Symmetry: C3
Subunit: 231 residues, 3 copies
Amino acid sequence: MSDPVSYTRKDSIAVISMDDGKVNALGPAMQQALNAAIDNADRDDVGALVITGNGRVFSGGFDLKILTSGEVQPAIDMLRGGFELAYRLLSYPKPVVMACTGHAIAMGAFLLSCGDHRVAAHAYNIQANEVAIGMTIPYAALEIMKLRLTRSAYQQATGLAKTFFGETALAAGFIDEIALPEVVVSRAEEAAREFAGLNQHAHAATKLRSRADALTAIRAGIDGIAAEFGL
Amino acid sequence: MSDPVSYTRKDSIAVISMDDGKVNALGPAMQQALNAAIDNADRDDVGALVITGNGRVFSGGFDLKILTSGEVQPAIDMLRGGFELAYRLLSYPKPVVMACTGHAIAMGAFLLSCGDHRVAAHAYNIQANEVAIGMTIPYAALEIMKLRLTRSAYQQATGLAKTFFGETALAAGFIDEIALPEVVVSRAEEAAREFAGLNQHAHAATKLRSRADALTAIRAGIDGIAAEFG
Amino acid sequence: MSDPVSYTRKDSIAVISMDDGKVNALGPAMQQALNAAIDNADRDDVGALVITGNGRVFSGGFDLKILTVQPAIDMLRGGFELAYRLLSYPKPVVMACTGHAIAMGAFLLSCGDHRVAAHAYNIQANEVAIGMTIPYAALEIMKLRLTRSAYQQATGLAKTFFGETALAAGFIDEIALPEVVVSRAEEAAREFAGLNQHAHAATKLRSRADALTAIRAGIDGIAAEF
Ligand SMILES: [Cl-]
């Protein structure tokens, strides 16, 4: 799909929407488009970001074709880019609100877990499915999940590839708020406009303090990706 | 008011009540009065402590006048003393039960978070409001919250200044028990009496083990308080 | 009793049941019998393990006669080695909590990848109530599963959990009716045996790395601090 990310500034917020016409795979093209959209948000100096998926998914994860192939450097580059995007969003100086508009799997769940506030509908599944399909979870991904999940949810989400949704996702720490499907996006935008009213300097400084060790470990995980591939 | 804390021994427990006639601001006078009451508990060798607020709040937090007066050293000194009190309570060798008798804001919430057991009523708001009013949360306060809040509640409580109460406070780890307003204090006292029946030596040793990293992090936060402002 | 652990292979899984006829005390004999049953699972290369208690308890904990110095140290080290063996097990481990789980019984329960109990069953580290400081190895096992605030109360206040409160605390993962705790555990185990074994084993070690290091330290330190 020709333009997998849209960027729209609406007063105090920017809305960044993923729709590649498929499952919003976080391959190189999608990552480039997402980074370009956040660059726009930087230039526009917005009060808050909203990131959404499409009518089917938030994101189904990395480009599975690149993963299943066995190619080495392309996979390393895709994983590094995905986790760098996570680092960028977790450290973002403005509030970031995720509109989880469908299921969020693997890198989709990791991306979702970078929002300051995360809104989903009851039925939307959130899952690190890596272990179910033969992939060991990268250290950077573990650190992203560890930052948000309860101790017991973290255990099951990782080693057992547990699927969460609705009340179990809320209790686990995979999402912060449940809304009806037709208002997930509007509620995300409402929340973003509210958070834009927080003191930006204090928000930016405090969120970094509240994530310092995780960010350091994510950085280490990004640096270590090639070694995870035996290089 | 000049006499903001009362101390009452009731057999196996001591009840320490904050009431400055207003919102129990945790300025130097209140901190000294709380410390004096805890000194009394030390001398009495009580089985457990109960700390309460007044009829309208647990505590609204630090003295707002001192906090925003522009005079840096008095503000630093007040924060230091507040976090020192938190350290003292988190490491206290007897069970400590908090009766959250109204809202608990900022340092009020941090103080609340030092209790082994914390009781509130459903409508009582518990909130680190720093970011909403333009303040970065001090490291010592972050570490206090980090010890009690779930991973996701910690994120929202801090960077988003989220308000918690009732079920969300329970789920988050900002409180351990919700009771009707009229029985918050008596529930806290009853719980304290039961905890006084635990083995004190094992309680004191176990709680320190269960808080070891938090305590060193809080101590670092206290030692680095001036550097936070310069 | 004379034969306190049973081992049965069914489908892709092994079911290991503790029943010493009493409260499944985790003394040296029970630990040896459990280790031998896990050996069977190793030899059979099973897809997953289910560990159950008996009709009255999961386990009441250590043999108190021994705990109340060298025999005590040895029993504690052995119990925490058993915990370590299960926490690091290369196949999914499902616990069928068939009654209460107290002290070492709760620590053992907390080593399962998935833990199923009935609403009524109490789970508690009662050490502080009975005059014992909780060992570091036990603290680290609990710290891996309990929420921040449940961890505080479970330890220093010897809080008892059950059903929805155990679920919220992270002392269990699933509640089932008493009569289906074991069958649900087996169903979960069959499901988990379908996960990729290599990825499961590698990922669980990563998700538990710091805890395993700290539990090893806790085992090593059992004597130095008794
Ligand atoms: Cl947690």
